[PDB]
Write a structure and sequence with these properties.
This is part of a larger assembly, with chains A, B, C, D and E. Chain C has four helices and five strands. Chain C is α+β, with helices and mostly antiparallel strands. Chain C is elongated. Chain D starts with 7 loop residues before the first strand and ends with a helix. Chain E is mainly alpha-helical. In chain E, 46% of the residues lie in helices and 0% in strands. In chain E, α6 packs across α7. Classes of the chains: A mainly alpha, B mainly alpha, C alpha+beta, D mainly beta, E mainly alpha. Chains in contact: A-D, B-C, B-E, D-E. One magnesium ion binds next to loops of chain E. One magnesium ion (MG) binds next to loops of chain D. Chain C binds two RNA strands through α1, α2, α3, β4 and β5. Chain B: Belongs to the eukaryotic ribosomal protein eS30 family. Chain B: It comes from Saccharomyces cerevisiae (strain ATCC 204508 / S288c).
Chain lengths: 67, 60, 144, 260, 185
RNA sequence: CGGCACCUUACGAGAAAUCAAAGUCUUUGGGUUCUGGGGGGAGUAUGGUCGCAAGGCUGAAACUUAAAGGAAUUGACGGAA
RNA sequence: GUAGGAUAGUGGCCUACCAUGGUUUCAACGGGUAACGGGGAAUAAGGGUUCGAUUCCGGAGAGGGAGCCUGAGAAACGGCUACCACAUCCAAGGAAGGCAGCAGGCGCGCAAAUUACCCAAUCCUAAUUCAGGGAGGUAGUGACAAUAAAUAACGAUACAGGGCCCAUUCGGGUCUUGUAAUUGGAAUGAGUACAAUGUAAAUACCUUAACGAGGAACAAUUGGAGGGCAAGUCUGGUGCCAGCAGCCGCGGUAAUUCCAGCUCCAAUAGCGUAUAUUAAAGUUGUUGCAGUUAAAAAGCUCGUAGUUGAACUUUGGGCCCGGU
């Protein structure tokens, strides 16, 4: 079997320079649990429709839909 | 060029052909072994040396 | 001097002379007039689906003596009426009146083949289930 | 259309970068900089592909943002910075200096120089002109404006730039009998001496160059870079010295070197 | 939008499909060298056509032309190296006179039978494709491997895959297990 | 010398009949113009142009078809000898 | 042409005043294009013929036109404005739109795949190592095309004649290709999988533990068997019918051609059909056709463009250097 190998000078210098997927492979990093690609982009495009924080918008929508 | 001839005889000979079933035979070998079989029947033992070669001789 | 001009500066006369005499070929004349698109029912194409209008039985040409069992097919993409030969034993029992057939050409780039007068296409599929496969036993024709 | 282009397709890259046809649809488009796009070598192509110091472009970025590489004494953290001809690349870790000179096949070679030679570079004079407030300036082949040059410096001369204070230490005229580094065309990378320069007023002055093996070749003056006198170059030449052995003599070298 | 992958067709169907002389001449080759198709003869004829035209246009050059002396020597060296051409007759007039059986002789399926080791070309075929005979230490299961005359001395059974010294196979292991349980414990 | 031709031969040419050109052509190039591209449809339709008109010049296509044709041989037939 | 205006700038680009020019049988102008141009592609004696929407370069366009804003860069359309076509929501007041991006639907048709996973690679953008990328990659569908090449291999036993000392007359360790839906033990991957590798994560490959071939049913097909053109005058059926047949032709009672069965042939994980094109086609002919009669010398002459056009002008000698 033929491959490639890296031996870093320290574990900290390995965690600095090594890809996160391959740290997850070796157990040096926990896998980040995000949403999937589609829900991330859908959330972004939903949040594009709000100007500002949306506190005023939420209060107005709540008050007006209360009546 | 008459176009309205009788169409009622269509499928006559295939319909009235007596259906005989395929017989059950051992499979021929496939691929390289079939070329081995052809080489044996054509260039090793030639029992049909009638002039040059007869490949499918009917019973005379 | 064997006809044609030969001189080094006589390339225009040779080129235009070949361009003029090039039209007497069948294929160049047909391809540059574009008669496959103007005429010749399948508009430059190989196959065409149509709808059967009526089953015909064509008298075969002399000296042959048979009924040729064709169909009259109106093409979907043109509306042109053609006659298409249903090309095996039986197989006219397989088509219908008023269903959809796929037609191909018939071997001779136009030029009605054999003893069939005026038929230059043939039925490859009926209802999309392929007359050869229907004829052997391989497929069953759909009811709709 | 419609604006400047920002992508370089792989197969539209310069051929001397030696990028593989597969493994991606795009090539690293060099940034704007001292050297033209098709006559430069980006730092990602130098580090990842030539030196093999990085496996990815992500690692080339990780190398450069630690301010390791420096081109001509300045750091140049861009991934696709156009390091072209004569450029001195110092990697302070690994303690080595490279000079981007062509090999004789027309490709930028990995050529390690010393720290003394890394303290200067050479520059072909592109124009000598008078700037504002009547101050003479000279423009080299890598975009350097150098004020108050020697008045004997003309176009097609070669100046020696000191890379720390970017001044002219000395210069080499364009005369018959001086070394040439051919920097363009199918004779690219070849080194020889000028036989003579053929004038052609109106366009494209030609130079007849003869190398050490007495093989003369004609090259346009855009591609001629003077590097020193007859012999004794001002730079260190790469391995091969710009000789252009034919392919029969090349396979003779290979069979005479691999048989031991 | 990557570079399109280059691909080539490595055989050529003959111009006349039904010639008794050619069909007998091809069945003799397919029964002598143990071939599967006639495509395995058309591939070799395609290689011969390419080699022979690459020599035929070099021979139109002057002698001691640089391209002739480079490419003809390379073509001769490659054919001599694979053993199609012998150690004498190193000439472009001698690579024109090559035949189809000179290339069929150098296959791994031909060479495994020729080096003892197989007792038939068809047994050589089924030994090669069943992960026996290795060419170096490398198991080769391609019958058209076309040995390059330095690997002739190292054609042998694999270090795995028995007849070369390994676990005794599948049907022998199962048949020995049934023989071991049928006697008792 | 120039002309209308003719007779013999086949060097040669040609599918042959025959040809001193229809030769000097697979050993293919002296110069040049025009024309033909299987048979019909068709010298038709239409357009242009010329004519007082008749028509002339130019001039298709769809479609159809496995031959049409050329030279010669043997026979048969002739209200041919 | 002169001058101005305009432009980022040249310029009839536009304006004002003058002049009457400019292109064309060396094909202008107009018409068609089922024309985006090129690198290139198919076929390859040579010359050619045909294709190039399509992975790279350049152009053009975002439903059709037009106009503009911002900006270095746009006459931008995942920017705006108007008109035209189309079309969505509505509480009828209004409001919103542009898949020739990716995936997908309808329609059209002979004709073309997933509303998948991810930025790990290639690169690009941004204040930027960090974010984003339907660009791109990965997988799914996929017989477009291309590469390699399973479907069996080896004996023993009954029988071959190719044979030995004149086997006289078969023996002998005969020599074993075929032949026993006999007979035996080996061989292995298609498949199924522990695992590891793979990978961004998986799938596949590659590597492998245990399984996994005897009718090795773990069963190769597609076209054919008159000629062209490889291969039957075998058998049953039909009887100018049915049908075959590219062409010639076959069929009217023994059909080598139809429908079948048996056998045989050709290519083979491929083979057949249709359409186009190339070679064949020296049947487009420059190479390289033909014109007496096969198609074809203008009825004849003059003549412009075009094509073509007699011979002649420093030859010869001698000496020296000088690369293979
Ligand atoms: Mg663009
Ligand atoms: Mg860049
Ligand atoms: Mg194994
Ligand atoms: Mg006289
Ligand atoms: Mg005609
Ligand atoms: Mg006329
Ligand atoms: Mg008229
Ligand atoms: Mg006549
Ligand atoms: Mg006649
Ligand atoms: Mg002005
Ligand atoms: Mg002006
Ligand atoms: Mg004006
Ligand atoms: Mg178009
Ligand atoms: Mg040819
Ligand atoms: Mg094009
Ligand atoms: Mg194109
Ligand atoms: Mg189009
Ligand atoms: Mg483009
Ligand atoms: Mg645009
Ligand atoms: Mg649209
Ligand atoms: Mg629009
Ligand atoms: Mg901006
Ligand atoms: Mg727009
Ligand atoms: Mg859009
Ligand atoms: Mg856009
Ligand atoms: Mg789409
Ligand atoms: Mg398709
Ligand atoms: Mg800042
Ligand atoms: Mg990111
Ligand atoms: Mg994409
Ligand atoms: Mg293939
Ligand atoms: Mg199978
Ligand atoms: Mg039959
Ligand atoms: Mg035959
Ligand atoms: Mg019969
Ligand atoms: Mg002809
Ligand atoms: Mg005639
Ligand atoms: Mg006359
Ligand atoms: Mg004249
Ligand atoms: Mg002259």
């Amino acid at each position: 079997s033929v491959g490639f190998g890296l031996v870093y000078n320290s574990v900290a210098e390995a965690k600095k320079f090594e890809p996160t997927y391959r740290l997850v492979r070796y157990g040096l990093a926990e896998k980040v649990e995000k949403a999937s690609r589609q829900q991330r982009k859908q959330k972004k495009n939903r949040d594009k429709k709000i100007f500002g924080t949306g506190k005023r918008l939420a209060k107005k929508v709540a008050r007006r839909n209360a009546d | 060029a008459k176009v309205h001839g009788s169409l009622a005889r269509a499928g006559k000979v295939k319909s009235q052909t007596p259906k005989v079933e395929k017989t059950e035979k051992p499979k021929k070998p496939k691929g390289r072994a079939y070329k081995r079989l052809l080489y044996t029947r054509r260039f090793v033992n030639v029992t049909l040396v009638n002039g040059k070669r007869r490949m499918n001789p009917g019973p005379s | 001097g064997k006809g044609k001009p030969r001189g080094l500066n006589s390339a225009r006369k040779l080129r235009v002379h070949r361009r003029n005499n090039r039209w007497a070929e069948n294929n160049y004349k047909k391809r540059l007039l574009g008669t496959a698109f103007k005429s010749s029912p399948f508009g430059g194409s190989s196959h065409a689906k149509g709808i059967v209008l009526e089953k015909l039985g064509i008298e075969s040409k002399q000296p042959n003596s048979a009924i040729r069992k064709c169909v009259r097919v109106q093409l979907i993409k043109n509306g042109k009426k053609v006659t298409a030969f249903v090309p095996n034993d039986g197989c006219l029992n397989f088509v219908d009146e008023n269903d959809e057939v796929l037609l191909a050409g018939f071997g001779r780039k136009g030029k009605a083949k054999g003893d069939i007068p005026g038929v230059r296409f043939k039925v490859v599929k009926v209802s999309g289930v392929s007359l050869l496969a229907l004829w052997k036993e391989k497929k069953e024709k759909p009811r709709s | 259309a419609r604006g400047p282009k920002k992508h370089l397709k792989r197969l539209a890259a310069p051929h001397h970068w030696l990028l593989d046809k597969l493994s991606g649809c795009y090539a690293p488009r060099p940034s704007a900089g001292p050297h033209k796009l098709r006559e430069s070598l980006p730092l990602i192509v130098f580090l990842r592909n030539r030196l093999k110091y990085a496996l990815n472009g992500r690692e080339v970025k990780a190398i450069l943002m630690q301010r390791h590489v420096k081109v001509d004494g300045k750091v140049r953290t861009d991934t696709t910075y156009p390091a072209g001809f004569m450029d001195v690349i110092t990697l302070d870790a690994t303690n080595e200096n490279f000079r981007l000179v062509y090999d004789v096949k027309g490709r930028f070679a990995v050529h390690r120089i010393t720290d003394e030679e890394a303290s200067y570079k050479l520059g072909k004079v592109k124009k000598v002109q008078l700037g504002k407030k009547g101050v003479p300036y000279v423009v080299t082949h890598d975009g350097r404006t150098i004020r108050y040059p020697d008045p004997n410096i003309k176009v097609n001369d070669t100046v020696k730039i000191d890379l720390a204070s970017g001044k002219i230490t000395d210069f080499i005229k364009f005369d018959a009998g001086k070394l040439v580094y051919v920097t363009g065309g199918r004779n690219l990378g070849r080194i020889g001496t000028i036989v003579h320069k053929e004038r052609h007023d109106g366009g494209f002055d030609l130079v007849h160059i003869k190398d050490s093996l007495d093989n003369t070749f004609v090259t346009r003056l855009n591609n001629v870079f003077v590097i020193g006198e007859q012999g004794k170059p001002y730079i260190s030449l790469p391995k091969g010295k710009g000789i252009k052995l034919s392919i029969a003599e090349e396979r003779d070298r290979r069979r005479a070197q691999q048989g031991l | 939008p990557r570079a399109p992958r280059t691909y080539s067709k490595t055989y050529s169907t003959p111009k006349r499909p039904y010639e008794s002389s050619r069909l007998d001449a091809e069945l003799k080759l397919a029964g002598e060298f143990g071939l599967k198709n006639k495509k395995e003869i058309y591939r070799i004829s395609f290689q011969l056509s390419k080699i022979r035209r690459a020599a035929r246009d070099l021979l139109t050059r002057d002698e001691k032309d640089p391209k002739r002396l480079f490419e003809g020597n390379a073509l001769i060296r490659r054919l001599v190296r694979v053993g199609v051409l012998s150690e004498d007759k190193k000439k472009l007039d001698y690579v024109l006179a090559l035949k189809v059986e000179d290339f069929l002789e150098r296959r791994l399926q031909t060479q495994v039978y020729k080096l003892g080791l197989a007792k038939s070309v068809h047994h050589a075929r089924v030994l090669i494709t069943q992960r026996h005979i290795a060419v170096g230490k490398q198991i080769v299961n391609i019958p058209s491997f076309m040995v390059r005359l330095d690997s002739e001395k190292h054609i042998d059974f694999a270090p795995t895959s028995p007849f070369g010294g390994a676990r005794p196979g599948r049907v022998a292991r199962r048949n020995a297990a049934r023989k071991a349980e049928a006697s008792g414990e």
